[PDB]
Amino acid sequence: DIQMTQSPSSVSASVGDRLTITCRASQGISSWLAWYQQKPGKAPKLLIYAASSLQSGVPSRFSGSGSGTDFTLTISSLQPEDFATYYCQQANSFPWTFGQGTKVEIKRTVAAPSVFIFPPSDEQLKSGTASVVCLLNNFYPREAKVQWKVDNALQSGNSQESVTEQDSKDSTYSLSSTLTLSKADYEKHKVYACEVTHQGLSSPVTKSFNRGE
Amino acid sequence: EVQLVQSGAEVKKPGASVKVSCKASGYTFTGYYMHWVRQAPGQGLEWMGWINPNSGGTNYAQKFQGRVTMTRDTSITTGYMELSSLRSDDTALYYCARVGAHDYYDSSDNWFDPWGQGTLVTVFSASTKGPSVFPLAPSSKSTSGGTAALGCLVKDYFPEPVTVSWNSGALTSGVHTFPAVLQSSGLYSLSSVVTVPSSSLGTQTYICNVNHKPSNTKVDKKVEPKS
Ligand SMILES: [Cl-]
Ligand SMILES: [Cl-]
Ligand SMILES: [Cl-]
């Protein structure tokens, strides 16, 4: 079988940069090479085929070059929506095989989060559980610290976080932290607070609410 | 429009079989091969085989030979991929893709285009469980500088995935649907949020459309400010 070796495995670049991604075949495949883009949550999409032909409808900043064993995908002017994983693929011989993929990430300016907090819904409380959600919206870089305080007591062991992939329009992250308690424990305290620390904030930001108000 | 629409995600026990379908529309069905490609956790892509829907002939990657069967039903322009004796590392996103021919690289027809949306097959002994959907209501504590945040919490489901749309697809700007977390119970949870003008919470309607296909759960939840 033909092995396809892609490099680099990942690259961080700025909007407007020229980016090059390489793919090396283990043997000569002439021009039987394609490049695909896989955006988050989506199927791959053909960008370039026959090493250098542009697929209809694909922005022309994506171009390909090379023949034989060494191939290059070029993005001439990187855009935020180019955050994606790119794969080469040979069609010279079955089995058709792919490179391991190159993850493209976008560098941008610092952006402070907007912070929102949600008490549990009355519907959920009826079921016996209280989920309290803290949202950090549209920040950069990804490093962020979320601390839960319940009646000014720092919490540990009862929250989970999830972060989005970089946004396709502004390259920021968003993050949810969910504090989960029994309805009984929830009803034993008044003040629920989410304290956010991030490079874009001069001082930590706290969003809080009093249970039942 | 040329499109390939695949069947929904499924959980299957180790040793069982799964049969994924790929409904083609908008092109001459017998005029293109249908290929299958799968994507494991490490996001590598792995070609599985093809079916020629005109002749019915197939060709499978040696890795899946004896375990995969590709078939088609021309009368409903649908292809199928059945993978038997499922094992833990068969957990993957399975894609169908259209390929025009295998002998002329210079044509755009003769590469994977388009692809189906993928079908997540989870190989595990646990039973399917549908999610609960709770509102994340906009309030004074989720309103900063003229913008309000609101959302839906989608809790306690198995296996992945759930999809969330807003207002049946008409609301996409500012939506963030978070990657699922694995709870200690073994069930998944995620939230989907959107930011909107605070000025119009009284006049706009915000409904999250939650789909968990493994359990045939579809939930539309209206999210409104709490009185
Ligand atoms: Cl060679
Ligand atoms: Cl409520
Ligand atoms: Cl509306």
Numbering used by the authors:
A (entry chain L): 1 to 213
B (entry chain H): 1 to 227
Text from the published report:
Beta-32 is highly potent against all variants reported here. We determined the high-resolution crystal structure of the Fab and the cryo-EM structure of the Fab in complex with Beta S. Crystal structures were determined for complexes of RBD with 15 different Beta Fabs: 6, 22, 24, 27, 29, 38, 40, 44, 47, 49, 50, 53, and 54, the Beta-43/NTD complex, and also for Fab Beta-32 alone, at resolutions between 1.7 and 4.0 Å (STAR Methods).
Alpha-B.1.1.7, Beta-B.1.351, Gamma-P.1, and Delta-B.1.617.2 variants of SARS-CoV-2 express multiple mutations in the spike protein (S). The RBD mutations found in Alpha (N501Y), Beta (K417N, E484K, and N501Y), Gamma (K417T, E484K, and N501Y), and Delta (L452R and T478K) are located in or closely adjacent to the ACE2-interacting surface where they have the potential to modulate ACE2 interaction or disrupt the binding of neutralizing mAbs. To understand this, we generated 674 mAbs from Beta-infected individuals and performed a detailed structure-function analysis of the 27 most potent mAbs: one binding the spike N-terminal domain (NTD), the rest the receptor-binding domain (RBD). A detailed structure-function analysis comprising 22 X-ray and cryo-EM structures is presented for 16 Fabs most in complexes with RBD or S, which allows an understanding of the changes in antigenicity of the Beta S protein.
